[PDB]
């Protein structure tokens, strides 16, 4: 998705803060949209990291964030 607020904020916030934000947002997407994938997505975020999803989640109008679950797994 594209969100001016989170896109601009994430571009200059420290890495620990952006990581916390992305991880929270991805697990919230899972909770709302495909709650049965919680354990699998959580383990994949721990194994692969979360910073790689910054662009698609916040700075990309063409990405529907519901599709982050398929992106992660
Ligand atoms: Cl504005
Ligand atoms: Cl938009
Ligand atoms: Cl899926």
Curated annotation (Swiss-Prot):
Disulfide pairings: 7-59
Protein's name according to its UniProt entry: Protein spackle
Keyword Signal carried by entry: yes
GO terms for cellular component: host cell periplasmic space
Superkingdom classification of source: Viruses
Primary localization class, coarse: host cell
Functional note: Inhibits viral DNA ejection into the host cytoplasm, thereby conferring the infected host bacteria with immunity against secondary phage infection. Achieves superinfection exclusion by localizing to the periplasm and inhibiting the activity of tail-associated lysozyme, thereby preventing penetration by the tail tube of incoming phages.
Location within or outside the cell: Host periplasm
Assembly and binders: Monomer. Interacts with the baseplate central spike protein Gp5; this interaction selectively inhibits the lysozyme activity of the baseplate central spike protein.
Keyword match RNA-binding: no
GO biological process: superinfection exclusion
Keyword terms: Disulfide bond, Host periplasm, Host-virus interaction, Signal, Superinfection exclusion
Family per record: Belongs to the Tevenvirinae spackle protein family.
């Amino acid at each position: 998705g594209y969100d001016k607020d989170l896109c601009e904020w994430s571009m200059t916030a420290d890495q620990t803060e952006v990581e916390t934000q992305i991880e929270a947002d991805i697990m919230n997407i899972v909770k709302r949209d495909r709650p049965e994938m919680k354990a699998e997505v959580q383990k994949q975020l721990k194994s692969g990291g979360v910073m790689q999803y910054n662009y698609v989640l916040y700075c990309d109008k063409n990405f529907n964030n519901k599709n982050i679950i398929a992106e992660v797994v």
